[PDB]
A and B are shown apart, each in its own frame.
Chain A
Amino acid sequence: LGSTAIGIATKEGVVLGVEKREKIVEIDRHIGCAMSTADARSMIEHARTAAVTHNLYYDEDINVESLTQSVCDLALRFVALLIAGHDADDGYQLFHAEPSGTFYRYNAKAIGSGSEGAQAELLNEWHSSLTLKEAELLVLKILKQVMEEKLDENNAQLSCITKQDGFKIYDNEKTAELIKELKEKEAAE
């Protein structure tokens, strides 16, 4: 019975959003992840260890693909993850990591309870020219679209990672605006 989590990659940041009803956690300054949730502490700790070790020895961000390989390996030698990061190898990237330890790349992805629902809407709205703010709003929309109760800054939560500001979890303000702005913007007609 997994809970909703959504990611949308763009050319100016990846955006992770969840149904709050602590589900977005930082792995490194350039890599967050959102999850469907206490079986995780070990994967998270591991992830972080890998990230920090690499960074210390190389003095650079770890390759998000390598990082996702490292966490999937852990499961492979036997819980569900949306890992999102920026690196200088393949820029913005988004991955889905299954409890199985198989992972795949995506550009939009939804996991959890309304996730066949959302993935359709993702599919016919995603394109490679979307701005971060479009994506921000897009995630909010899908989240209202599927949520049990209404959408306020208290039961859904946003975050993003960008080349320049590293990872971020939006506080209730930034998000208070955006949910209000999705209200105004979807009242055009």
Chain B
Amino acid sequence: ISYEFQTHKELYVQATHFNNTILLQIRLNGEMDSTYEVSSKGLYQVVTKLGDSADPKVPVVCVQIAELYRRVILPQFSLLISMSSKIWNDFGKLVFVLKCIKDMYA
């Protein structure tokens, strides 16, 4: 099940739902280069698949996006994010991306 949205250096969003996970792309001028898994212990716990695993900006953006889902978008938890690291305003930015995710109903 696919949804996607594009807005404005341009930001592209796309998601793909499954029984076991979602899978979100956040592209910047078509670019995407990092991959984080934001799964929860049942009752959040980011893991870095490819990118800078020591950037402290990271788990913040992730856990934000993870809340935007878990408690505002639907309709034991697992998201996969792939994004342009080049995105990092900077709180102003995170707010834009998050409104872009809701503009395709996520």
Contacts and interface: CB of A to CB of B under 8 A. Distances in A.
Are A and B close enough to touch in the complex, i.e. CB under 8 Å? yes
11 contacts: A50-B51, A53-B33, A53-B50, A54-B33, A56-B33, A57-B84, A66-B52, A69-B53, A70-B52, A73-B53, A77-B47
Nearest to B32: A57
A49 interface: yes
Given A53-B33, A57-B33, A57-B85, A73 B50 contact: no
Contacts, number: 22
Of all A-B residue pairs in the complex, the 8 with the closest CB atoms, nearest first, are A57-B33, A73-B53, A69-B54, A53-B33, A69-B53, A66-B52, A73-B48, A53-B50
Nearest to A72: B53
Contacts of A69: 52-54
Contacts of A57: 31, 33, 84-86
Interface residues of A, number: 11
Interface string A11-50: 0000000000000000000000000000000000000011
Given A57-B31, A57-B33, A70 B53 contact: yes
Interface in B27-83: 31, 33, 47-48, 50-54
Contacts of B85: 57
Contacts of A77: 47
B47 A66 contact: no
Interface in A54-99: 54, 56-57, 66, 69-70, 73, 77
Contacts of A66: 52, 54
B86 A50 contact: no
Nearest to B31: A57
Given A50-B51, A73-B53, 16 more contacts: A50-B50, A53-B33, A53-B50, A54-B33, A56-B33, A57-B31, A57-B33, A57-B84, A57-B85, A66-B52, A69-B52, A69-B53, A70-B52, A70-B53, A73-B48, A77-B47
